[PDB]
Structures are given as structure tokens and as C-alpha cells.
Amino acid sequence: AFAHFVLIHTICHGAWIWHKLKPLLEALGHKVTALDLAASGVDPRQIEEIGSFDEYSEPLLTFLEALPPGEKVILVGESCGGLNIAIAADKYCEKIAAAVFHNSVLPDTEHCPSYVVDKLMEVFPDWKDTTYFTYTKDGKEITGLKLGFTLLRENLYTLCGPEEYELAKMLTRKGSLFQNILAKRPFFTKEGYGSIKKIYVWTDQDEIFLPEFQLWQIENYKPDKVYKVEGGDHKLQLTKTKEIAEILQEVADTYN
Amino acid sequence: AFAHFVLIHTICHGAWIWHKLKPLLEALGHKVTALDLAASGVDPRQIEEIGSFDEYSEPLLTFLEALPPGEKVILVGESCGGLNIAIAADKYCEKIAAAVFHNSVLPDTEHCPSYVVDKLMEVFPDWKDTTYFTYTKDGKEITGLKLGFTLLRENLYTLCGPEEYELAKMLTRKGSLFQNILAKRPFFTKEGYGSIKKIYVWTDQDEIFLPEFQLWQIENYKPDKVYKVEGGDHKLQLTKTKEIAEILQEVADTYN
């Protein structure tokens, strides 16, 4: 079967992270959309204009709003993109055939939206040469970050080639996790986000979303299906592109 | 010898086009700077804010201004980047050890700045599915363009892999050649631009800067040195990265 995949990058990244996976999925016959979220990739906004994870998610929500009735997509979110998935599923659940988490945060419906982010920082407290700043938007102080180049090399892009690491140095931008805004946000809903099918894809060789964290997430909120990819790194769409495409084909054949 | 190379992308592109060449040059021991020009790559400006090729060139001029006295760079410009080189050399000639043209426009000092652009459009009049628009800045009508995806596939990225073509689809932006603004600009100077050493690199397999055009440019304004790269495509920094690095090493060993 063929599906329409919507690929959702993480904070400080853009659609460009999907540049290997998108053509491979198209070569299987799928339709692929790879979005830039707000203030990401070649989006014209700067992060200081963005006040929440919901606002950050606007391009995904706008896309989903534009789907004609009856068209369903498979969302694929990497790293912090699982939060964009949860936000989207609470507006457009009827348009989502399934959601695939790719070394991603896995929010739940029992705890507040920041819960898994809070846990991630416990497990991975030291972001190396990452820099931080503050800005104010809609009366709240937001912590922005710029991912450190050593962090990128060693922990995110560990096994990626030098030309892929170079893209990350060139293209990663200032962003935010909006952690304190998530902490005050209404909970993700059981009827919306809770009802979607959730497929969790990971590698135990991830040097930032470490095994303790990922296995904690799987026990916290049981996925419908778990795929463990052997080897690779946090950026499986770069280091294990073929394996990711194979998994996504199986998801397209399972959930519609 | 080692050099400091400053890599200058073409219109509608960004530093990302250099993502393969930059690490290869660093692996030879060089220092490399790959800039986003105004309204290009992850630069925060939109093209409608930009009124001339000189304004478009601001990041390059600002960079050069920041070099301490005595530091000299080798400029490397692809495609329309030769115009940025000429503009830079008329402000900062003493900071330029040499300029390398990489399937690039080669402006002169005898004719007005638009001359080689005018010629290019004669030789290559049909930009396929490229779209155009107008905007007004500083009382002039400017023609903007967005490079067509068929043009990108067939004429710019002819022999590039699908993951490189994908980056171009994701990352190319609206831009402008500022052709009518160039046509009214003061001529490039003999003392400045005319005095720099100029190395012209090309392939006769380029499907946009066709051989008639490139050989016309070489006869119009004789380079100090010409290198012809066999095979490849317009994006030699993607299809012949190793060969380009080899040439640049020789330039570093020749001109300081």
C-alpha cells in the first residue's frame, strides 16, 4: 500500500534532515511532505517571535487543515517532534492514520505535557557546548537554545558522515523546547491524541535519547508497536535510512 | 600551503551547497568560511527587502571587513557568485589573494556590470518551470525568481544524487539577479576587481552555463588560469568535489 507521510523535524532543525528518507519513500510509491515548523529551516520567522510549542507547530496544523475530507496521513516525528504530533492529534485526529515516533519524545495523557521533557533532562542533563538565552513572549520568559557543535558531532550525528554533520552546522538554528510553557499547558486529550495508533522506533545506540530514557518512555505509555533498529545513531533517517523506509512501508501496510 | 577559502553560493542557494566541499578542504588543512548571502540560506531577510546585488552581497562584505590587517582569503564563487566576487574586490582588494570562478559569471571592467548576465540569458533563454514575480525596492522594479524544480533536476543538478536534488528542492528560496540594477551600476574598477588574480574552473558538461557561454566569457576577459573539469554537472562541488578540492589546493600553493 501507499501512504502520505508527513515528516516532522525536531527543534533547531528543519525539513532538510529528511533529505535522504524522502526520496527513498517516494521510490516506494508514497507521497511525502517534509515541513519546516515555525522559525525552523527556511521558515521566515525567528524563534523570539514564537511563544509556545503550539505556535511552533503552526505549519503542521495549517497543513493538516488543508487536507480535504477523507484524506489521512501518517505522521513521523523525530526527537522533540513527538510533541508536535500530540498537539496535531488533539486538533486533527480524524486525519491521522498513525503516528511514528523516531527516537522521539512520547507524550502521554496522564501527566502534564512537559513530563517526558522533564525526564529527558534528568537522564541527559549536560548538553555540552549548547548555548542558552532568554526572550519574553506573551508575558512569559522562554529559554532558547542553540545546539552546540560538539554535541551535534558526538551525541546527535555520532555516526553520520562529515558532509551530513556539515549540513547540521550550517543549517541548525536557534530554537526552544518551551519547557515551562508545556508545564502549564492543558494535558493532551484521551479522545484525540490518546486515540491514535502509535509506533515507536528507536536504537539503543542513541547517544542523546539514551536507552534508559527510551525504555522508560515505552513503559510509561505503551505503544501499539515497537521497532528497534540495530546500530546507527540518533539520526536514523541519515544512518539507517533504508531500515526506516522499510519500517514505514510496514506501517503503511498495517494502519490506514 | 594552507589558505582561508571563502565559499560564495549562487542566487536562490545558500552555504548548504558547499556541504561536501567544506569538510574536504578542511581535511587538507585549510580554513573555510561558507556564507549565507542576504535573504539566502538561513539568513533572516526575505528577497523583497533587498534592492541590489551590492545589498545582496552584504554578508560577504561584512565578513571581509572583519578580517584583521594582513589576512588574505581566496574567494570561490559558483554560478552568479562571480558578481559577488567583483563587488567584494572593489571594496577589499587588498584582502583577496585570488578569486576562483566555479561555473560562474565572469564580470569585466570594460562593459557594464550586467554584460555577462545579458549574454547568459541570450545563450540560455528558457528557464523551464522557473517562476517570476516583481517587487519594488528603493523606487525600482525588481524581478524575483524561484528556480523551477524541473530546471533544478535537469539543468543544475543533472548528475547529482536524489538526496542532493532533494536538498535543493527543500532549501532553494526566492531570489533575484537584479539584472536591471546591475545595468545601471557603476562599472567594476580596474584598480580593484581588475587587479585580482582570477582562476576560471568549468565543465563543458554544464547544462545551464553552456559551453558557448563559458568559452565566450574566457575570451571576453582572459583569466590568469583556466581549469576544465571533465564530466560532472553545473554543481561540480557536489559531482566532482574531490577534483574541485585538488584544484583549490593548487590555487592555494600558487597565489597568496
Domains of chain A, start order = 1-256 (3.40.50.1820)
Give the 3-state secondary structure of B35-76: ECCCCCCCCCCCHHHCCCHHHHCHHHHHHHHHCCCCCCEEEE
Chain B residues with CB-CB distance to A147 below 8 A: none
Q: Tell me if B158 is assigned to a ligand binding site.
A: no
What CA–CA distances, in Å, run from B60 to B7, B15, B37, B47, B197? Answer: 10, 12, 7, 16, 18
Q: Identify the sign of the CA torsion B61, B67, B69, B74.
A: negative
> In this structure, what C-alpha cell is assigned to residue B208?
545551464
Rounded CA separation A181/A117 (Å): 12
Q: Which residues of chain A does B147 touch, with a Cβ-Cβ cutoff of 8 Å?
A: none
Q: In degrees rounded to 5, what are phi and psi of residue A144?
A: -90, 160
Facing residues of B6 across strands? Answer: B33, B75
Q: Is A88 strand, coil or helix?
A: helix
Which among A13, A50, A170 is the top mutation candidate for probing chain B, defined by the most B β-carbons within 10 Å of its own β-carbon? A170
In angstroms, the separation between the Cα of residue B109 and the nearest Cα of chain A is: 34
Residues 6+ apart with CB under 8 A from B132: B143, B144, B145
| B235 marked ligand binding residue | yes
Helix, strand and coil content of chain B, in percent to the nearest 5, comes to 40, 20, 40
Which positions ≥6 away from B204 have C-beta within 8 Å? B211, B214, B228
Contact check, Cβ <8 Å, A41/B162: no
* B9/chain A closest Cα distance in angstroms: 13
The three-state secondary structure class of B4 is: strand
Q: Which residue spans within B60-216 are E strands per DSSP?
A: 73-78, 96-102, 131-137, 140-146, 175-176, 198-202
Cβ separation of A46 and B46 shorter than 8 Å?
Answer: no
Nearest to B19 among A23, A46, A166 (CB): A166
Report the C-alpha gap between A10 and A13 in whole angstroms: 6
Whether chain B has a CB inside 8 Å of the CB on A46: the answer is yes
Q: Are B108 and B115 in contact (CB under 8 A)?
A: yes
- Cβ of residue B242 closer than 8 Å to a chain A Cβ: no
Residue B241 marked as a ligand binder: no
CA–CA separation, B172 and B149 (whole Å): 10
Residue B61 C-alpha cell reads as 562584505
CA dist B256 and B242 (Å) reads 22
Distance between CA B89 and CA B112 in Å, rounded?
Answer: 16
Q: Do B167 and A23 touch (CB under 8 A)?
A: no
Q: Which amino acid appears at position A132 of this protein?
A: Y
**Max alpha carbon distance in chain B (Å)?**
48
Query: How many angstroms separate the CA atoms of B155 and B149, rounded?
Result: 10
- Which helix (H) or strand (E) segment holds residue B98: the answer is strand B96-102
Q: Which of B14, B27, B46 sits opposite A44 (nearest CB)?
A: B46
Provide the 3-class DSSP secondary structure of residue A74: strand
What number of C-beta contacts closer than 8 Å exist between A and B? 57
- From B46, B162, B171, residue closest to A16, measured CB to CB: B171
Helix or strand holding residue A109 (H, E): none
**Residue A25, SS3?**
helix
Q: Three cell numbers at A69?
A: 475530507
Say which DSSP state A133 is in.
E
Contact A40, A111 (CB under 8 A): no
Is residue B145 within 8 A of residue B131, CB to CB? The reply is: yes
CA A127 – CA A104 distance, rounded (Å) = 17
A-chain CB neighbours of B27 within 8 Å are 162
